[PDB]
Structure 1
């Protein structure tokens, strides 16, 4: 029955190409190896949109366990799953949906900038572990739940020249964007998640209290951000038309921000900021030269990152 099931799913996909968009490249999508950093609400909905698109290789990276309030919001878990590790449970759930899925779960902890390193070697192994996973996949979806957690993955993906689709949620809004990648032939690079402010990511969790901020969101933002993130990926994977920023699947916006209170969606674009604590060339050069020796310093000393990127230079400038 697996065979007939496989054919039935494949035919559904083939029909959109054969009868609707003959120029559609389904193969590129099918063979895309996807790395999902975060198996929470976004990770679960993104993975579901991805399998519907024919993607066969998805790897979840999450070190948490299914909590009691998770199931109603994280679409791959059930009540009976509570207490079990998320990453592996998520991969197993995708296979229950479609057995031919090459779904894997890795219970990996992403070293967070601004947090004290507790076990040098142990977190050095995490770093290399993360870089390797990023290197072996084609598209990296950054679906974590803190500003800090998005830093290391952003840098490593840029370093490994991988396309990154970053999705983040607010109570009533969401952001979906593709980070720019550096190109020698072109002097036009798109911004990343960190190009929009002037402070180095740092610890925003340890000191956090309900007073600082609540984490609850309207259910709808996760489903919307997830579907748009995947649709952005499938379009971006298509060959764009000669004289435009469009493909057979439509536009390939750099950044998308949506809001539920007024049911709106804005398409935006921003260039890579030279003093970005994540993609600044100075930060890239630092990594290329010292690798982990540089990262370990930025991780414990976010203010150092600002010195390296040049954010201190522009603040000191206004300081005078």
Structure 2
């Protein structure tokens, strides 16, 4: 029955090209290898939106386990799943939906800048493991839940030259954006999640208390951010039109921010900031030059990172 099922889903995709958008390229989408850093609310919704699009290769990266309150908000897990490791359950879950999916679950811990290294060798392995995964996939979705967890992936992904789609939620809002990639021929590079502030991502969980901030969000933000995130990827995957920033599936914004209280959505754009503690040229040079040696330093000394990117040369300038 698998054949007839495969054919059925396939025909549905073909119909949108054949009868509506003949210029649409479904193959590019189908063959795209996707790496999902995060198997929580965003990770579950984004992954559901991707099989619907025809994507066959999806890999989940998450080191946590299914919590009691996860099911109602994380659409790939059930109540019986509680206690079990997420990444794998997640891949198993996609297969229960479409058995031909090439779903995989990697229980990997993403080293977080700002936290103390607990096991050098162990966390050096984590580091290489993550880079390999980013290396083998085509689109990396940054669906983690802390500012810190986004730093390493942003960088490795910039180094491996992969496209990155970053999604993050707030209680009432959401941000979905694609990081720029450094092109030799184009003196124009779009910003990354980190080009918007002037502080180096650091430990924000260890010191966290309810006083600091509650993590609950309005259910709606997760669903929205995910769909917009996947529709961005599918459009971005289309050849753009000669004289415009558009494709067969429409625009291809750099940054999208939404708000529920006033049911709005803004498209935006921000150029790469040279003192970014993530995409700054000085930071890329340091990585290319020293690899894991430099990262280990940034990892335990966020301020160091600032010294490297120049975020200090500018605060120091204002300081005087």
TM-score of the superposition, structure 2-length normalised? Answer: 1.00
Deviation at 1:84, TM superposition (A): 0.0
Per-residue Cα deviation, 1:187-246 (whole angstroms, up to 9, x for no partner): 000000000000000000000000000000000000000000000000000000000000
Per-residue Cα deviation, 1:53-106 (whole angstroms, up to 9, x for no partner): 000000000000000000000000000000000000000000000000000000
* CA distance in structure 1 between the aligned counterparts of 2:271 and 2:35, rounded to whole angstroms: 25
Deviation at 1:260, TM superposition (A): 0.2
Q: Secondary structure at the match of 1:68?
A: coil
Q: Secondary structure at the match of 1:20?
A: coil
Moved over 2 A (4+): none
* CA distance in structure 2 between the aligned counterparts of 1:292 and 1:312, rounded to whole angstroms: 23
Per-residue Cα deviation, 1:135-164 (whole angstroms, up to 9, x for no partner): 000000000000000000000000000000
Alignment of 1:218-229 (within 5 A): 218-229=218-229
Map of 1:170 onto structure 2: 170
| Pair 1:261-2:274 in alignment | no
Q: Secondary structure at the match of 1:22?
A: coil
* CA distance in structure 1 between the aligned counterparts of 2:292 and 2:286, rounded to whole angstroms: 10
* CA distance in structure 2 between the aligned counterparts of 1:217 and 1:201, rounded to whole angstroms: 22
* CA distance in structure 2 between the aligned counterparts of 1:291 and 1:280, rounded to whole angstroms: 16
Q: Secondary structure at the match of 2:69?
A: coil
Deviation at 1:306, TM superposition (A): 0.1
May I ask how many residue pairs the two structures share in their alignment? 320
Q: Secondary structure at the match of 2:312?
A: helix
Deviation at 1:310, TM superposition (A): 0.2
* CA distance in structure 2 between the aligned counterparts of 1:157 and 1:105, rounded to whole angstroms: 19
> Which structure 2 segments of 5+ residues have no match?
none
Per-residue Cα deviation, 1:253-287 (whole angstroms, up to 9, x for no partner): 00000000000000000000000000000000000
Deviation at 1:166, TM superposition (A): 0.1
* CA distance in structure 2 between the aligned counterparts of 1:186 and 1:46, rounded to whole angstroms: 31
* CA distance in structure 1 between the aligned counterparts of 2:79 and 2:274, rounded to whole angstroms: 47
TM-score of the superposition, structure 1-length normalised? Answer: 1.00
* CA distance in structure 2 between the aligned counterparts of 1:274 and 1:192, rounded to whole angstroms: 11
Alignment of 1:68-217 (within 5 A): 68-217=68-217
Q: Secondary structure at the match of 2:164?
A: strand
Deviation at 1:11, TM superposition (A): 0.0
Deviation at 1:33, TM superposition (A): 0.1
* CA distance in structure 2 between the aligned counterparts of 1:318 and 1:76, rounded to whole angstroms: 49
Q: Secondary structure at the match of 1:21?
A: coil
- Aligned CA RMSD, in angstroms, stands at 0.2
